[PDB]
Amino acid sequence: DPGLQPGNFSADEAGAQLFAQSYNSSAEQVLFQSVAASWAHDTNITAENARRQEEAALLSQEFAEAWGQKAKELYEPIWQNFTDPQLRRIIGAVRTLGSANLPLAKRQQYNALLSNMSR
Ligand SMILES: *[C@@H]1O[C@H](CO[C@@H]2O[C@@H](C)[C@@H](O)[C@@H](O)[C@@H]2O)[C@@H](O[C@@H]2O[C@H](CO)[C@@H](O[C@@H]3O[C@H](CO)[C@@H](O)[C@H](O)[C@@H]3O)[C@H](O)[C@H]2NC(C)=O)[C@H](O)[C@H]1NC(C)=O
Ligand SMILES: *[C@@H]1O[C@H](CO)[C@@H](O[C@@H]2O[C@H](CO)[C@@H](O[C@@H]3O[C@H](CO)[C@@H](O)[C@H](O)[C@@H]3O)[C@H](O)[C@H]2NC(C)=O)[C@H](O)[C@H]1NC(C)=O
Ligand SMILES: *[C@@H]1O[C@H](CO)[C@@H](O)[C@H](O)[C@H]1NC(C)=O
């Protein structure tokens, strides 16, 4: 999907600015979809809505993971100097991939551990 997949970009301050500018164009839509599905679940508890809620949650997680991986591979060495506070905060927020840095087996074990503790 073009929306969930970032395009080619440049590893410079101007490239970072274009990265942040393009970040809205997909993040707005993805977050609106996910949070709207969650709101529909929380207002109409019917058994249909939970499937949409979980599908949108997975979609948002994958979008964030892909964008964060691209931002990492493009700006990790140059994550210090930007001469722009707002773009620095944006890049720091996107770069933090979190639990996606684990391999497949370890990521599955981690998600299973969280779910099992909750249960
Ligand atoms: C997450 O939880 C499941 C379910 O078991 C529950 O959690 C355990 C940690 C204990 O507190 C249980 O009392 C509780 O019911 C765990 O699966 C359990 O482990 C065994 C050995 O793995 C399961 O047999 C197989 O295990 C794997 C998947 O784990 C697959 O090959 C099979 O699908 C099959 O489930 C066993 O079925 C299951 N026990 C019960 C009573 O259902 C699971 O291991 C755990 N995951 C992690 C990462 O801790
Ligand atoms: C953050 O990203 C969003 C998405 O690109 C940017 O906001 C968007 O801004 C445009 C106008 O600049 C909005 O268009 C307007 O939308 C509605 C359509 O019903 C209506 O008010 C007008 O007819 C007009 O077309 C647009 O809605 C809006 N958001 C989205 C999600 O499309 C915003 O500029 C970005 N902020 C940054 C980069 O700082
Ligand atoms: C990004 O660059 C790679 C370089 O291999 C290319 O394959 C890919 O098509 C590019 N993506 C876009 C969306 O242009």
Number of Cα atoms under 13 Å in the Cβ half of residue 50: 3
First-to-last CA distance in the chain? 34
Ligand of minimum distance to the alpha carbon of 25: 2
Counted residue by residue, the chain has a size of 119
| Cβ of residue 8 lying under 6 Å from some atom of ligand 3 | yes
**DSSP letter string, 45-81:** --HHHHHHHHHHHHHHHHHHHHHHHHHHHHHSTT-S-
Instruction: Kindly provide the resolution of this structure in angstroms, with one decimal.
Output: 3.0
Helix (H, G, I), strand (E, B) or coil at 104: helix
Residue 93: C-alpha distances to residues 25, 61, 72, 87 (Å): 17, 14, 11, 10
Q: Which atom of ligand 2 is nearest to the CA of 24?
A: 2
What CA dihedral angle connects 15, 21, 26 and 30, to 10 degrees? 120
